[PDB]
Each structure stands twice: as C-alpha cells, then as structure tokens.
Design a protein that fits this description.
The protein has 227 residues and is mainly β. The protein folds into 2 domains: 121 residues, Trypsin-like serine proteases (Thrombin, subunit H), CATH 2.40.10; 105 residues, Beta Barrel (Thrombin, subunit H). The protein has 1 helix and 14 strands; from the N terminus they run E-E-E-E-E-E-E-E-E-E-E-E-E-E-H. The strands form 2 sheets. A 7-stranded antiparallel sheet has the order 6-5-2-3-4-8-7, covered by helices on one side. The protein has a 6-stranded antiparallel β-barrel with strand order 9-10-11-14-13-12. Strand 3 and strand 4 form a beta hairpin. The protein binds zinc ion. Zinc ion binds next to loops. One of its GO terms (cellular component) is secretory granule.
C-alpha cells in the first residue's frame, strides 16, 4: 500500500497473509476458505491470520496450511496473460479459529457504485518504484473509479469482471505484495487486488481489481463440492 496508513490493531480481522515464494494478501470468507489472487499460485503456502505486524509475537496470530487451491478456470497464467479472472480459492488444512482478531467477511450482494469510497489493505510495497515489504498492515482509502479510467478493461469483454480504483492524482495505490487482499467499498468486500507490479501510484493510472460480485456463483459452487 503506497500512500496509506497503519491499520488499527485487529481492525481487518479477515485480512490474511498468503506466503510461498510470493507475499500476497488473502481474505477469510469462511473458517475454511481464503480468497486470494491466482497470481499467488504455488505448490505450497503458509496462511497467516490474526496479524497486524508480520514479524511480531501477536495474540490472535494463527497459521494454517492449505489442502487444495482452485484458480478461476479462465485465469491465464504469466497465450497472453492478463489480469482478468485473477481469483484463487484456498481450502485450509484445518479451519481458522474465529477469535477477537480473526473473523470472516461476507461476499457482496450488490453492485459497487462508481465514486464510492473504498479501503484496501496489505503488507505490500509502500514505495511505488521499488519493493519494500511493510511489517505492519497498511490501509488506504481510495475511490471506485469508472472502468473507463482503467485501460485494461477495454480488452475483450473483461470490463465485465473488473473494477477500477485509486486516485487519478496518483499517490495512493495497492502495490507489489498486496495482490489477493481486499477492496472494501462503503463497508462491503467488492474486489480482490490483482497483480501490482512497480511502478505503482502513477497519476492517471488507477488499478484493476476482480469484481467479486461476478464470481460468487463460482465461489459458492466450489465450497459446495468441497465439504
Ligand atoms: Zn500478471
């Protein structure tokens, strides 16, 4: 998170850290499921829950293993790779404890409004040009912008599955390491951060997020088949 602030202690209880050869964010949607970006795909993972500081002895800290991962079918890995359908479900080895620090967040049930105020969190890069892992969870308030503002949305019909957010002025963005974290507008979880390569927070260059609302059906069905 470039241009944000330190989130208040345990104010984002559904935020997880997904770790393998990549740092990613994740979001707890069920004691047993974590949604993240497909970009974070790997043979293994370590899921960190209930944390503020990634490198600290914290009380609600939990660590889970993954049993199985499900990348959205239409994601094309880095055939030309794009950031549409950048979604992956992680089925936890054993459920997360729902504590005063670890809680689930709900899937959205309504379409996001252009101009609504959104918050994004992560331990990703706080420097827009180079990668500086942040120990503390960072939070930033941005805006839901018209998809017209995001150049990526003009491809095929990807507009359909993407949200566009940030500030036209730059200075505030999600960045490398933030992929897979949440985008919460007006209190709703509406997006999943996609790939955030440096440089970030460029003026007139808002970022791409998975329009969650469009994948709940897929999310639903998967969890259903994986009791
Ligand atoms: Zn990519």
């Amino acid at each position: 998170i470039v241009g944000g602030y330190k989130c208040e202690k345990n104010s984002q209880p559904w935020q997880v850290a997904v770790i393998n050869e990549y740092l990613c964010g994740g979001v707890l949607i069920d004691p047993s499921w974590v949604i993240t970006a497909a970009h974070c795909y790997s043979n293994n993972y370590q899921v960190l829950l209930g944390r503020n500081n990634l490198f600290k002895d914290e009380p609600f800290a939990q660590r889970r293993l993954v049993r199985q991962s499900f990348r959205h079918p239409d994601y094309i890995p880095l055939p030309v790779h794009d950031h549409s359908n950048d979604l992956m479900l992680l089925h936890l080895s054993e459920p997360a404890d729902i504590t005063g620090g670890v809680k689930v967040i709900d899937l959205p049930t309504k379409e996001p409004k252009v101009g609504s105020t959104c918050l994004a969190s992560g331990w990703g890069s706080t420097n827009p040009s180079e990668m500086v892992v942040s120990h503390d969870l960072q939070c930033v308030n941005i805006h839901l912008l018209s998809n017209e503002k995001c150049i990526e949305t003009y491809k095929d019909n990807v507009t359909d599955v993407m949200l566009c957010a940030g500030e036209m002025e730059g200075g505030k963005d999600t960045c490398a390491g933030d992929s897979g974290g949440p985008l919460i507008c007006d209190g709703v979880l509406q997006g999943i951060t996609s790939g955030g390569a440096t440089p970030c927070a460029k003026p007139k260059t808002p970022a791409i997020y998975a329009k969650l609302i469009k994948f709940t059906s897929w999310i639903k069905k998967v969890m259903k088949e994986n009791p």
